[PDB]
């Protein structure tokens, strides 16, 4: 998914925020990892909403 | 830190899930309670600070 901001860091089991609630959620086991990187100059879109 | 701002608030129905849209980098390190669980417990008195 293309979620951005500090809500990427808030991605964790629990800790309900303002974006991570209705964007993506895992069961209360989280049997895996989560990869994220700063795509500043990669997906820079002005009107790509 | 020289002069604190301690406001012992009175009874209200303030929902603690309001500052979820605050400024970026809003850490919540609750050492004794749970952040998402602050919606059903009835606390006696809250002692805010600043």
Swiss-Prot record, chain A:
Superkingdom, taxonomy of origin: Viruses
Ranges where the record places region Integrin-binding motif: 4-6
Phenotype upon changing residue 9 to S: In strain: Omicron/BA.2, Omicron/BA.2.12.1, Omicron/BA.2.75, Omicron/BA.4, Omicron/BA.5, Omicron/BQ.1.1, Omicron/XBB.1.5, Omicron/EG.5.1
Effect listed in the UniProt record for changing residue 46 to P: In strain: Omicron/XBB.1.5, Omicron/EG.5.1
> Quaternary form?
Binds to host ACE2. RBD also interacts with the N-linked glycan on 'Asn-90' of ACE2. Cleavage of S generates a polybasic C-terminal sequence on S1 that binds to host Neuropilin-1 (NRP1) and Neuropilin-2 (NRP2) receptors. Interacts with host integrin alpha-5/beta-1 (ITGA5:ITGB1) and with ACE2 in complex with integrin alpha-5/beta-1 (ITGA5:ITGB1). May interact via cytoplasmic c-terminus with M protein. May interact (via N-terminus) with host bilirubin and biliverdin, thereby preventing antibody binding to the SARS-CoV-2 spike NTD via an allosteric mechanism.
Task of the protein: Attaches the virion to the cell membrane by interacting with host receptor, initiating the infection. The major receptor is host ACE2. When S2/S2' has been cleaved, binding to the receptor triggers direct fusion at the cell membrane. When S2/S2' has not been cleaved, binding to the receptor results in internalization of the virus by endocytosis using host TFRC and GRM2 and leading to fusion of the virion membrane with the host endosomal membrane. Alternatively, may use NRP1/NRP2 and integrin as entry receptors.
User: What is the official name of this protein in its record?
Assistant: Spike protein S1
| Taxonomic source organism | Severe acute respiratory syndrome coronavirus 2 (2019-nCoV)
């Amino acid at each position: 998914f293309v979620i951005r901001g500090d809500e990427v860091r808030q991605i964790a089991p629990g800790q309900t925020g303002n974006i991570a609630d209705y964007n993506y959620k895992l069961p209360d086991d989280f049997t895996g990892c989560v990869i994220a990187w700063n795509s500043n100059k990669l997906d820079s879109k002005v009107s790509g909403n | 830190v020289y002069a604190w701002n301690r406001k012992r608030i009175s009874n209200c129905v303030a929902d603690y899930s309001v500052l979820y849209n605050l400024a970026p980098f809003f850490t919540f390190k609750c050492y004794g309670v749970s952040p998402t669980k602050l919606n059903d417990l009835c606390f006696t008195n809250v002692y805010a600070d600043s």
